Amino acid sequence: FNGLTGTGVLTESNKKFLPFQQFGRDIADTTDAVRDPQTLEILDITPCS
Amino acid sequence: SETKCTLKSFTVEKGIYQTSNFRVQPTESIVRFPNITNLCPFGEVFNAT
Amino acid sequence: MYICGDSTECSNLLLQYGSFCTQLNRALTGIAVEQDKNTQEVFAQVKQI
């Protein structure tokens, strides 16, 4: 997603991303959500394995 | 067999063993870029006089 | 998952450090079993309810 390379399952999320907010991070500074550039819906990431 | 490989032994005692992941996670790839379509100015940078 | 989360290249690189994840997992499992043993020794003195 727009250079945000990452392996993991993408699933629809219930987050409340503000319009300016784009990525969405967590405590460990690891991207756990992305706002899709095509559709403004957000998708959270769960690692596989 | 996963448990046996985790312990590096061919015999396994009785109990609970937390097993390491010897499995194949990934399936495919997805690339979602913005739709912007116009060539970048490069002839005026490299081919300029 | 902590060091080289769902990255096969990083897992292959981590395999060159030997049995380091195994040692940490063994220590943590021992600590957890010790906690269970602590609770059992403190409370399960008499086995007549």
Ligand SMILES: *[C@@H]1O[C@H](CO)[C@@H](O[C@@H]2O[C@H](CO)[C@@H](O[C@@H]3O[C@H](CO)[C@@H](O)[C@H](O)[C@@H]3O)[C@H](O)[C@H]2NC(C)=O)[C@H](O)[C@H]1NC(C)=O
């Ligand atoms: C600066 O000007 C040069 C002039 O040499 C440009 O080089 C030319 O670039 C075009 C477009 O890529 C080349 O055409 C292509 O070449 C091959 C032929 O085998 C193939 O990929 C395509 O079928 C197409 O015809 C052209 O050959 C090439 N000319 C030379 C002499 O190498 C260059 O693109 C301009 N821009 C920059 C940023 O350098």
Ligand SMILES: *[C@@H]1O[C@H](CO)[C@@H](O)[C@H](O)[C@H]1NC(C)=O
């Ligand atoms: C590009 O166009 C698509 C529809 O074709 C739209 O959903 C998407 O948001 C656009 N992407 C941009 C403007 O980055």
